């Protein structure tokens, strides 16, 4: 009813189709694609929130869903660096 | 070799004017003599840095390691003790003070006190179990009671691979 | 000598908070950098940016035997003990109520533990 | 003066300072002996503290022309003994101007039941930095400039404030 | 109404303003005699604290800062100056002097403490200045040139919680304080002003209903009230209330409160916003109340 | 209007009761904090205490805002003890500590009023509290370890205490020399407190070491502080912040024990 809560409902199957593309020998490619999926939905939700009239209460969930997936996107970025170093060392 | 360290330290003390600047290079001069096993020349160049940087915990720790490699127990301990005074984050060096005191005197209340300080920085440690065991075997019948409660209470943190179950 | 000069540009109240922070983020002055870091991410960044710069200065001043130099970089920064756990306690001792509320949300908690 | 106090520098200063604080300022030059002693030992900050106590005592006991002349010239000796110091340390320390030096040999104060009623002597302390000796030097000089015009004002001026003096 | 106390201010000449501190423990007054005077007024006693001299003309308004910054007063004058004064250790001295105006400065008003220590000042050249305390004695100035045509007469800040302007914020972020103020002038306009994302100041809205020079304008404190409200008065003897019933609409409506027989000089809100005081040109004050019918009724005739 | 009618005849705690029926949280918090910021007095009177206990124990008003208000009042009425205290009734120790270290510690040391300064410092010392205090280990802990070193010698000067406790005392003194070295002295007083703390520590170290070096059991004499080996004194005295006449009689005491190390080296 919020649009954001309706627009992110693919990611539960999109992350599964990305897991079923990779292996433990492509386990960083998996997390770089998880950042591209979350960053694509951050791009979509930003391109909805930037089009909401200020004070329209409904877009509260759209903004929380944007920030939640933006913090998720950078948490996949963090994982994709530090666990690569710790395995190379 | 010695002569390469001497040739480097001669040209690097040539490329130094004042005495305090020569002392400020003394830490690196001392490391190079230690890397030639010239332990007194290392001691002599670290002390001539310490008398110009009284507060460097690294220089006190390096002088302590040079006294450990001269078997001088309480001088290794004093330089390690002084390095813990100048940087208390060295839990490893609190343990190394207990390690060198229990290897010098088992009756020493400082050995038992520095083990107290090591245990309160590393609980559940078999190296600290054996540093207690080595005191408690020497505490006799009063030792045996403390040794039973120790063996029970630290097996309750790690079931041992062999020794503590036999003991 | 340039870092000693940039630290001096960070500590006179007549410089702008942002210019003090610019020279601080390039000279290790966490104490003049935290006066501008106004998110959780900025506050974690201030500690980590100075932790690397301080550890780099400690390896350099152990390995590069300079000559004639008669001024010190400050002993609050040269004498700095660092650990990852410490930074994530200092991030809970801060007065910045925003950082204390962000340091309780789910992804900022995950970010602490993945860094540790 | 020159070296008769190996181990003993702590006693000689206490002997001269206790003798100085017991005696009349116009009968024995103990503050100038103690100034010369501290100056020979390059202890300019103790020399200046001694000379400032001397100038403070002179205006507060010794309301005479030569008492104002020693007040000005002892404040001067104190001030120049601060100008010889780095601004890191160029300051004097005193009990507040109303705290009591209970003079040596005085019987301690009592209740009627006969106890020594030593009230807690909260050491509220005057600190005076280099400007404040320029200020009291300017005012002591002006107490004296009034005395070197009106000989009757001498009976008041030695412990007058700036607005009294205006 | 009941009198508590009757101050004699020792002023030799016409008083232009009388303002108490945030707690009602001190009073400040200013005059054609070039002085500003500060009093203790506690419990119906009265004592002089200071005779603050250091303007060179008649002083036209005073304003106390919020006590979160300590004991600070501002005052403005015919000589083009705004002076900021401060109490430290119990004595009052000048803590800033701003002469950056091209004619008489007719009004001053402090921001809500929630915005930082900021002063606004309105001038007879037609400009407005804003003075932001940056720290350790320093002040940023911003000057909005030509803010009114003919001249600027009054300035008043919007309260830092704009009604409705919080509902989209999820639990744990800071409020984005939208700094705004109102100003009146000799162009017959009231104008609303806002800070934009570059820190420049902008004319957000015009308010047009007086037929003559606007003398004064005051924003209502947002205590309990869900609407945004302003009062303003004029050289044609009118007072208008202005409501904005939706903060997303930015749409203001003028309601005529009264029309007096002469000029109205000043408008002053109660600290609970529920009552307005109105200074009439026949030397009177009248007091006005909003009813539960939203009608404005006098409580002093 | 009714909250203003309750403020006007002085029922400001009931003006809060009316304003607490505001369904809008953002207006409700501001209206209650703004009203508290007017009415909360520095004098914690029976009437203020009755209203504060009514607001906290009936109306659940967060007590943080009563003392936020008393801090804004303590700024206006200049009391920096009640400002530092009411801002700690808001949060953290640091305000009491950074008052003590500048305005109480140096005079308390110069007055030998250790047992008073301790009364603040051992309430700040617990690990629930000192772990939240800025600059503690180089300030409050240095003043407090100095006092506790004096207390543990005040006790060893009265009781048959063990070598384990004199080992502890020598370690506590050795831990203190290169920390009096590190005190943030601001005033004319702090530099004097630091330097007689240093003079006291140099001579505490002598008495602690002559109890580690007592005589052989052929003369029942008292333990000589001048028999103490130079070899254990100089590496710690060579860091103590002491004036040059204080350092002169220290250096003369060190030549005195060096001459005893030479004379009892030619027999």
PDB file of N, CA and C in Angstrom, chain C residues 14-61:
ATOM      1  N   UNK C  14      40.296  29.762  15.866  1.00  0.00           N
ATOM      2  CA  UNK C  14      40.095  30.696  14.755  1.00  0.00           C
ATOM      3  C   UNK C  14      40.023  30.028  13.371  1.00  0.00           C
ATOM      4  N   UNK C  15      40.479  28.781  13.217  1.00  0.00           N
ATOM      5  CA  UNK C  15      40.212  28.009  11.999  1.00  0.00           C
ATOM      6  C   UNK C  15      38.779  27.432  12.016  1.00  0.00           C
ATOM      7  N   UNK C  16      38.160  27.332  10.836  1.00  0.00           N
ATOM      8  CA  UNK C  16      36.833  26.730  10.647  1.00  0.00           C
ATOM      9  C   UNK C  16      36.845  25.245  11.075  1.00  0.00           C
ATOM     10  N   UNK C  17      35.783  24.739  11.738  1.00  0.00           N
ATOM     11  CA  UNK C  17      35.687  23.316  12.147  1.00  0.00           C
ATOM     12  C   UNK C  17      35.981  22.355  10.988  1.00  0.00           C
ATOM     13  N   UNK C  18      35.547  22.699   9.773  1.00  0.00           N
ATOM     14  CA  UNK C  18      35.791  21.876   8.589  1.00  0.00           C
ATOM     15  C   UNK C  18      37.238  21.948   8.082  1.00  0.00           C
ATOM     16  N   UNK C  19      37.937  23.083   8.197  1.00  0.00           N
ATOM     17  CA  UNK C  19      39.361  23.154   7.822  1.00  0.00           C
ATOM     18  C   UNK C  19      40.250  22.443   8.853  1.00  0.00           C
ATOM     19  N   UNK C  20      39.919  22.586  10.144  1.00  0.00           N
ATOM     20  CA  UNK C  20      40.553  21.836  11.239  1.00  0.00           C
ATOM     21  C   UNK C  20      40.397  20.331  11.033  1.00  0.00           C
ATOM     22  N   UNK C  21      39.196  19.879  10.669  1.00  0.00           N
ATOM     23  CA  UNK C  21      38.926  18.485  10.335  1.00  0.00           C
ATOM     24  C   UNK C  21      39.631  17.997   9.055  1.00  0.00           C
ATOM     25  N   UNK C  22      39.746  18.836   8.018  1.00  0.00           N
ATOM     26  CA  UNK C  22      40.498  18.522   6.789  1.00  0.00           C
ATOM     27  C   UNK C  22      41.967  18.235   7.108  1.00  0.00           C
ATOM     28  N   UNK C  23      42.636  19.113   7.859  1.00  0.00           N
ATOM     29  CA  UNK C  23      44.037  18.895   8.220  1.00  0.00           C
ATOM     30  C   UNK C  23      44.197  17.791   9.276  1.00  0.00           C
ATOM     31  N   UNK C  24      43.232  17.615  10.186  1.00  0.00           N
ATOM     32  CA  UNK C  24      43.200  16.509  11.143  1.00  0.00           C
ATOM     33  C   UNK C  24      43.107  15.123  10.477  1.00  0.00           C
ATOM     34  N   UNK C  25      42.242  14.951   9.469  1.00  0.00           N
ATOM     35  CA  UNK C  25      42.071  13.698   8.715  1.00  0.00           C
ATOM     36  C   UNK C  25      43.291  13.306   7.847  1.00  0.00           C
ATOM     37  N   UNK C  26      44.312  14.173   7.812  1.00  0.00           N
ATOM     38  CA  UNK C  26      45.589  13.999   7.116  1.00  0.00           C
ATOM     39  C   UNK C  26      46.806  14.113   8.071  1.00  0.00           C
ATOM     40  N   UNK C  27      46.587  14.270   9.385  1.00  0.00           N
ATOM     41  CA  UNK C  27      47.650  14.409  10.403  1.00  0.00           C
ATOM     42  C   UNK C  27      47.393  13.669  11.726  1.00  0.00           C
ATOM     43  N   UNK C  28      46.329  12.865  11.810  1.00  0.00           N
ATOM     44  CA  UNK C  28      46.042  12.005  12.961  1.00  0.00           C
ATOM     45  C   UNK C  28      45.272  12.659  14.114  1.00  0.00           C
ATOM     46  N   UNK C  29      44.816  13.909  13.975  1.00  0.00           N
ATOM     47  CA  UNK C  29      44.156  14.634  15.068  1.00  0.00           C
ATOM     48  C   UNK C  29      42.661  14.253  15.225  1.00  0.00           C
ATOM     49  N   UNK C  30      42.390  13.020  15.674  1.00  0.00           N
ATOM     50  CA  UNK C  30      41.044  12.516  16.018  1.00  0.00           C
ATOM     51  C   UNK C  30      40.243  13.497  16.902  1.00  0.00           C
ATOM     52  N   UNK C  31      40.948  14.136  17.836  1.00  0.00           N
ATOM     53  CA  UNK C  31      40.473  15.093  18.844  1.00  0.00           C
ATOM     54  C   UNK C  31      39.904  16.387  18.232  1.00  0.00           C
ATOM     55  N   UNK C  32      40.351  16.784  17.035  1.00  0.00           N
ATOM     56  CA  UNK C  32      39.786  17.886  16.230  1.00  0.00           C
ATOM     57  C   UNK C  32      38.945  17.402  15.029  1.00  0.00           C
ATOM     58  N   UNK C  33      38.991  16.107  14.691  1.00  0.00           N
ATOM     59  CA  UNK C  33      38.154  15.480  13.657  1.00  0.00           C
ATOM     60  C   UNK C  33      36.739  15.130  14.160  1.00  0.00           C
ATOM     61  N   UNK C  34      36.615  14.530  15.348  1.00  0.00           N
ATOM     62  CA  UNK C  34      35.316  14.191  15.952  1.00  0.00           C
ATOM     63  C   UNK C  34      34.353  15.394  16.099  1.00  0.00           C
ATOM     64  N   UNK C  35      34.805  16.646  16.328  1.00  0.00           N
ATOM     65  CA  UNK C  35      33.984  17.856  16.209  1.00  0.00           C
ATOM     66  C   UNK C  35      33.250  18.101  14.874  1.00  0.00           C
ATOM     67  N   UNK C  36      33.468  17.312  13.806  1.00  0.00           N
ATOM     68  CA  UNK C  36      32.663  17.380  12.559  1.00  0.00           C
ATOM     69  C   UNK C  36      31.943  16.095  12.148  1.00  0.00           C
ATOM     70  N   UNK C  37      32.324  14.944  12.701  1.00  0.00           N
ATOM     71  CA  UNK C  37      31.777  13.642  12.319  1.00  0.00           C
ATOM     72  C   UNK C  37      30.386  13.419  12.927  1.00  0.00           C
ATOM     73  N   UNK C  38      29.326  13.666  12.155  1.00  0.00           N
ATOM     74  CA  UNK C  38      27.950  13.827  12.651  1.00  0.00           C
ATOM     75  C   UNK C  38      26.975  12.715  12.180  1.00  0.00           C
ATOM     76  N   UNK C  39      27.510  11.564  11.749  1.00  0.00           N
ATOM     77  CA  UNK C  39      26.814  10.260  11.625  1.00  0.00           C
ATOM     78  C   UNK C  39      27.557   9.147  12.388  1.00  0.00           C
ATOM     79  N   UNK C  40      26.926   7.981  12.589  1.00  0.00           N
ATOM     80  CA  UNK C  40      27.630   6.765  13.021  1.00  0.00           C
ATOM     81  C   UNK C  40      28.794   6.417  12.081  1.00  0.00           C
ATOM     82  N   UNK C  41      28.560   6.370  10.766  1.00  0.00           N
ATOM     83  CA  UNK C  41      29.585   6.098   9.749  1.00  0.00           C
ATOM     84  C   UNK C  41      30.755   7.091   9.821  1.00  0.00           C
ATOM     85  N   UNK C  42      30.493   8.399   9.957  1.00  0.00           N
ATOM     86  CA  UNK C  42      31.548   9.407  10.160  1.00  0.00           C
ATOM     87  C   UNK C  42      32.365   9.174  11.436  1.00  0.00           C
ATOM     88  N   UNK C  43      31.724   8.665  12.489  1.00  0.00           N
ATOM     89  CA  UNK C  43      32.364   8.472  13.795  1.00  0.00           C
ATOM     90  C   UNK C  43      33.224   7.209  13.791  1.00  0.00           C
ATOM     91  N   UNK C  44      32.746   6.105  13.196  1.00  0.00           N
ATOM     92  CA  UNK C  44      33.572   4.908  12.937  1.00  0.00           C
ATOM     93  C   UNK C  44      34.749   5.281  12.033  1.00  0.00           C
ATOM     94  N   UNK C  45      34.486   6.040  10.964  1.00  0.00           N
ATOM     95  CA  UNK C  45      35.501   6.499  10.017  1.00  0.00           C
ATOM     96  C   UNK C  45      36.588   7.326  10.702  1.00  0.00           C
ATOM     97  N   UNK C  46      36.230   8.254  11.595  1.00  0.00           N
ATOM     98  CA  UNK C  46      37.208   9.062  12.323  1.00  0.00           C
ATOM     99  C   UNK C  46      38.197   8.202  13.130  1.00  0.00           C
ATOM    100  N   UNK C  47      37.709   7.185  13.852  1.00  0.00           N
ATOM    101  CA  UNK C  47      38.575   6.257  14.583  1.00  0.00           C
ATOM    102  C   UNK C  47      39.453   5.429  13.635  1.00  0.00           C
ATOM    103  N   UNK C  48      38.879   4.793  12.607  1.00  0.00           N
ATOM    104  CA  UNK C  48      39.633   3.915  11.701  1.00  0.00           C
ATOM    105  C   UNK C  48      40.653   4.674  10.832  1.00  0.00           C
ATOM    106  N   UNK C  49      40.290   5.855  10.314  1.00  0.00           N
ATOM    107  CA  UNK C  49      41.171   6.736   9.527  1.00  0.00           C
ATOM    108  C   UNK C  49      42.404   7.159  10.329  1.00  0.00           C
ATOM    109  N   UNK C  50      42.233   7.477  11.616  1.00  0.00           N
ATOM    110  CA  UNK C  50      43.348   7.848  12.506  1.00  0.00           C
ATOM    111  C   UNK C  50      44.104   6.625  13.033  1.00  0.00           C
ATOM    112  N   UNK C  51      43.442   5.486  13.249  1.00  0.00           N
ATOM    113  CA  UNK C  51      44.094   4.231  13.636  1.00  0.00           C
ATOM    114  C   UNK C  51      45.100   3.774  12.570  1.00  0.00           C
ATOM    115  N   UNK C  52      44.722   3.782  11.284  1.00  0.00           N
ATOM    116  CA  UNK C  52      45.659   3.479  10.185  1.00  0.00           C
ATOM    117  C   UNK C  52      46.791   4.509  10.130  1.00  0.00           C
ATOM    118  N   UNK C  53      46.479   5.809  10.175  1.00  0.00           N
ATOM    119  CA  UNK C  53      47.484   6.884  10.084  1.00  0.00           C
ATOM    120  C   UNK C  53      48.508   6.844  11.242  1.00  0.00           C
ATOM    121  N   UNK C  54      48.049   6.501  12.451  1.00  0.00           N
ATOM    122  CA  UNK C  54      48.860   6.329  13.664  1.00  0.00           C
ATOM    123  C   UNK C  54      49.736   5.070  13.612  1.00  0.00           C
ATOM    124  N   UNK C  55      49.199   3.927  13.165  1.00  0.00           N
ATOM    125  CA  UNK C  55      49.967   2.683  12.990  1.00  0.00           C
ATOM    126  C   UNK C  55      51.017   2.813  11.869  1.00  0.00           C
ATOM    127  N   UNK C  56      50.684   3.514  10.778  1.00  0.00           N
ATOM    128  CA  UNK C  56      51.628   3.889   9.712  1.00  0.00           C
ATOM    129  C   UNK C  56      52.766   4.755  10.263  1.00  0.00           C
ATOM    130  N   UNK C  57      52.465   5.758  11.093  1.00  0.00           N
ATOM    131  CA  UNK C  57      53.496   6.586  11.734  1.00  0.00           C
ATOM    132  C   UNK C  57      54.381   5.780  12.698  1.00  0.00           C
ATOM    133  N   UNK C  58      53.815   4.796  13.404  1.00  0.00           N
ATOM    134  CA  UNK C  58      54.555   3.919  14.315  1.00  0.00           C
ATOM    135  C   UNK C  58      55.523   2.986  13.559  1.00  0.00           C
ATOM    136  N   UNK C  59      55.129   2.400  12.423  1.00  0.00           N
ATOM    137  CA  UNK C  59      56.040   1.596  11.584  1.00  0.00           C
ATOM    138  C   UNK C  59      57.127   2.477  10.932  1.00  0.00           C
ATOM    139  N   UNK C  60      56.755   3.645  10.379  1.00  0.00           N
ATOM    140  CA  UNK C  60      57.701   4.597   9.771  1.00  0.00           C
ATOM    141  C   UNK C  60      58.719   5.079  10.806  1.00  0.00           C
ATOM    142  N   UNK C  61      58.285   5.553  11.977  1.00  0.00           N
ATOM    143  CA  UNK C  61      59.189   6.064  13.016  1.00  0.00           C
ATOM    144  C   UNK C  61      59.964   4.948  13.756  1.00  0.00           C
TER     145      UNK C  61
END
